[PDB]
Design a protein around this nucleic acid. Sequence first.
DNA 1: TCTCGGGTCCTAGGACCC
DNA 2: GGGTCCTAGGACCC
Length: 342
Amino acid sequence: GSRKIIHVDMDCFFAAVEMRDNPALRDIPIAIGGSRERRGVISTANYPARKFGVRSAMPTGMALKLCPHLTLLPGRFDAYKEASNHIREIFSRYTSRIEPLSLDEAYLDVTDSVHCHGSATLIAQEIRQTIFNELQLTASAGVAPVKFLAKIASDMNKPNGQFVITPAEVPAFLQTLPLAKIPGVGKVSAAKLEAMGLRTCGDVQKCDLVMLLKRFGKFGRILWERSQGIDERDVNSERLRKSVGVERTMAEDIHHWSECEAIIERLYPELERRLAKVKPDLLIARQGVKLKFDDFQQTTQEHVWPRLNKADLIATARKTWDERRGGRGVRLVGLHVTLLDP
DNA sequence: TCTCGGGTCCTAGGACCC
DNA sequence: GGGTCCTAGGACCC
Ligand SMILES: Nc1nc2c(ncn2[C@H]2C[C@H](O)[C@@H](COP(=O)(O)NP(=O)(O)OP(=O)(O)O)O2)c(=O)[nH]1
Ligand SMILES: [Mg+2]
Ligand SMILES: [Mg+2]
């Protein structure tokens, strides 16, 4: 009853495609992200820039303090999508059991695949080669019997490598595995678990499920299962998008509704075009708005509504702006829809 | 350094249905 | 009293 899962993850994705496309970027530190005047964060960085401490999600101000020669790119989304499509077309050559998690990443279930004497190890290696040939980009991969461990596997010899975990290896692997490396356990959760004296999967194995259920709910069952190596989640292939949103962060906090309103007018065309792309009639389940203040509270107002409408989005943004700003500057405005179900 | 924009899934109270 | 819808927010991931 053992499956074979591969997680494939491109290396330094956005930056890899920039450096391929312009090689003077290879050995100098670069990153894709908004400028510090635009109040941006880093989307990603290349290895020369990570060496200085630059990471995804870091404020751009902080990146340039740390790495003052940082060349900042705005990023070219069609180029990244062109590459993404090609790599999924490549995965398709080996199986149809494909679950993408982003542009750069996917799970494959190759249990019932006959491509390299049924070797998951060899299949992954053949996919990383071939991606390298063809795209001149490099990928890493993790091979394992369940999703989470393939994904964790894939970070252990990156860049441009891969790592396998056999069922026989799983237990020693879990013993000292930090809970924080499990997907879905982030900062807030890791620190709650540390406070109870739980750092690794090992520690959690010595724990009562019933208590994990009391302290954390469905998530506590997931921890318990994941600590044991249990992950019965199946590679899907049928996932579909459920919402589309658009939001922008102004270089300067804004203080008057005239300014907010001017911001929405710019937002709405972008949201209408993105939504037309997958729903030409513009029919939806709900639409709504979002503001984020000065001090990072953030509220949303969203309701049932049958078709994208600009003025209603302006109405609500007005109410929301009257009723829950209280004199704080606003750093971002956003719009949003929830897509019909089937 | 001062904190993005695209999403996903989980929770939870009161409404509403039976 | 027990489902399921409706809304808002939070944690998380890429
Ligand atoms: N806007 C934004 N984009 C991001 C963020 N994180 C990632 N991206 C975009 C930019 C990334 O290029 C891409 C894939 O994300 P990863 O696989 O998490 N990291 P990469 O592939 O860059 O590095 P590694 O070699 O360690 O895999 O997604 C973020 O916080 N914000
Ligand atoms: Mg990657
Ligand atoms: Mg990824």
